[PDB]
Automatic annotation (TrEMBL), chains A, B:
Organism, as annotated: Escherichia coli
Family to which this protein belongs: Belongs to the nitroreductase family.
Subunit structure: Homodimer.
Name of the protein in its database record: Oxygen-insensitive NAD(P)H nitroreductase
Gene3D superfamilies associated with the record: NADH Oxidase
Pfam family of the protein (one): Nitroreductase
Length: 216, 216
């Protein structure tokens, strides 16, 4: 199932504006973003899904300067996801993680809740106090979600492309992510490709396993 | 159904050592690692898949210090992959990627290749000179590959777990990395779950969409 899905999914370079997402797939697109794994269930992310031609326009302002080639993907596609990560990891936000676990039924007795809180506060203190790469630590959790997402919509029969070529500073101001405490990382449109997408036609290229893989 | 994949996948806490992956799953292990997307198709990664008990043993040395609780996962699983990323982005890896694309037939005229090649060195030079996030860029792409991998193995009917609690320095010395020009980031075992894995039983926990998601 998944092997040939991974072998034909491709970064679409041109979208068909009229092919809109099913009312329900517009809710499973929501579902794949939430139920993705994260270091100690940190989930240090926030998502802005733009489905309107008012919302899709505000994001595409980001694709300025040397990013002009990525703007039609922002507009022509039906549903545009903007991946964001926390700037810094506060104590109350990790309190929110465990309490949500508590309500969802992961702990029998109270002892386990405290333990996880500090199993989390071990790794958190490891990165936010000793290594001082918490921003980057949290960012890598979201690129994992990106990867989870790009295979998800592909198997769901939807076209998509991941994009980093955008001016984060404006997208941060446009939706005030600096004020909330977040930073844009990757913009993934999803929709349906036009035959104006020259990548649907071209064969996939990877480097051979003898270069990339080691068996022991 | 891929949505049911995201709702039934779980971080396995105990593997059954007997149930080994079939050689076809053992040839499918490699393709998901190979055919994952990449920013400018850099693919700044290397994978060590350890398939026999002595190969699995060398990896499990990482989880010997204050990470012992994660060590049996590396021991009982059948195929253990440790994701690695390049230290620094050389010019020749940019040379081999595009040359490999040319060999697979992506460029009609030679001019298209050169355009593709430096559009790559636009992002590359930006991260190695302008941004200073030479390593962190070569790290986030493989966390993305992890994400693609974690849903692949779930949909493949396989049990898996991401691991960060390991001594990167030890495993890098163990297989003589960074001299290689690579770095361990995450260790992913995959195999089949044992009766001792009480994570398969617990209800999935996430933060509610009202917290993490904004529709515009
Ligand atoms: C998986 C598991 C294995 C064993 C031997 N037990 C359990 C759980 C259990 C309880 C709480 N948590 C918090 C937690 C959640 C996520 C992450 N994370 O992946 O980050 C870390 C920690 C995890 C597992 C459990 C329950 C509910 C009752 C009993 C007696 N047990 B257990 F027998 F101790
Ligand atoms: C993090 C990330 C960022 C990307 N950014 C862009 C981009 O800015 N512009 C673009 O045309 N493609 C972008 N891509 C698509 C890649 O060029 C593409 O995945 C790679 O060439 C392999 O092609 P494939 O998606 O068909 O496997 C990005 C991919 C990733 C993973
Ligand atoms: C990057 C990453 C690193 C992880 N490292 C560990 C780890 O070191 N030990 C562990 O028990 N679980 C680890 N996990 C599993 C997470 O705790 C788990 O994904 C999270 O609690 C949600 O659980 P789920 O995988 O069942 O959806 C890791 C997960 C990710 C994504």
């Amino acid at each position: 199932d998944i092997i040939s899905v991974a072998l034909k999914r491709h970064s679409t370079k041109a979208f068909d504006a009229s092919k809109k997402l099913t009312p329900e797939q517009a809710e499973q697109i929501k579902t794949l973003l939430q139920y993705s794994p994260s270091s100690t269930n940190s989930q240090p992310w926030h998502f802005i899904v733009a489905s309107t031609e008012e919302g899709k326009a505000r994001v595409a302002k980001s694709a300025a300067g040397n990013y002009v080639f990525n703007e039609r993907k922002m507009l022509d596609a039906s549903h545009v996801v903007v991946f964001c990560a926390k700037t810094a990891m506060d104590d109350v936000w990790l309190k929110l993680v465990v309490d949500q676990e508590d309500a969802d039924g992961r702990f029998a007795t109270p002892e386990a809740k405290a333990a996880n809180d500090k199993g989390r506060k071990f790794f958190a203190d490891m990165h936010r106090k000793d290594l001082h790469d918490d921003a980057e630590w949290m960012a890598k959790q979201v690129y994992l979600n990106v990867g989870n997402f790009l295979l998800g919509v592909a198997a769901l029969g939807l076209d998509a492309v991941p994009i980093e070529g955008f001016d984060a500073a404006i997208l941060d101001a446009e939706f005030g992510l600096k004020e909330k405490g977040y930073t844009s990382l990757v913009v993934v449109p999803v929709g349906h490709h036009s035959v104006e997408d020259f990548n649907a036609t071209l064969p996939k290229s990877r480097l051979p396993q003898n270069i990339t893989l080691t068996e022991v």
